[PDB]
Design a protein around this ligand. Structure first.
Ligand SMILES: Nc1ncnc2c1ncn2[C@@H]1O[C@H](COP(=O)(O)OP(=O)(O)NP(=O)(O)O)[C@@H](O)[C@H]1O
Length: 175
């Protein structure tokens, strides 16, 4: 299931568990690899599979997602090949006030409308997405990234997650 990626492209980011690289085989994609030791007692393979599967479940449910295409490995590290979102902003940086959305009007309008649509679907379906977070693309579109699970349950916590991010766009559009 895990397909070898002999050569990695330029590094574009790093989080609490994953290093992310340009895919050399496809410029539209990136290679997202779990760094050794970050997943503790759960095999990283199981995290990668759950990331891919949950992404496909959410796509099937109509959510906007960073699409994921395959399980990959490189030098014994495992992960997921995904769409590359150029100049992406991490939602956690925005809600943490570590970074700021651009002032652009159309940009914040896309953030607002996309957050509305995500909340709308969460509320209607009544599903909960574990570790819900997003990438915001260069036009302001909001894409679910690194979802760990989705289950039918109270959507209130997930909605609060989206509302966190939307509030920054909402505040910009009022000013
Ligand atoms: N599909 C992508 N396209 C573009 N940049 C990406 C993509 N996935 C991740 N990145 C960048 O790489 C960084 C690390 O990815 P991320 O998936 O958030 O790491 P993580 O360790 O799995 N979880 P986290 O601790 O929340 O960052 C992000 O903050 C982005 O800057």
């Amino acid at each position: 299931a895990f397909h070898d990626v002999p050569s990695l492209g330029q590094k574009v980011g790093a989080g609490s568990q994953k290093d992310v690289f340009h895919s050399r085989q496809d410029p539209r994609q990136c290679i997202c690899l779990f760094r050794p030791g970050t997943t503790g007692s759960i095999p990283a393979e199981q995290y990668a599979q759950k990331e891919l599967e949950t992404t496909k479940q959410l796509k099937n449910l109509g959510f906007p997602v960073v699409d994921a295409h395959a399980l990959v490995k490189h030098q014994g590290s495992v992960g997921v090949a995904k769409d590359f979102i150029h100049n992406a902003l991490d939602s956690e940086d925005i809600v943490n006030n570590k970074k700021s959305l651009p002032d652009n009007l159309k940009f914040n309008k896309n953030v607002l409308e996309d957050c509305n649509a995500i909340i709308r679907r969460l509320k209607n379906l009544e599903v909960h997405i574990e570790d819900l977070q997003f990438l915001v693309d260069h036009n302001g579109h909001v894409l679910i990234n690194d979802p760990r699970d989705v289950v039918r349950s109270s959507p209130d916590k997930s909605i609060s997650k989206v509302n966190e991010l939307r509030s920054h766009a909402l505040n910009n559009l009022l000013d």
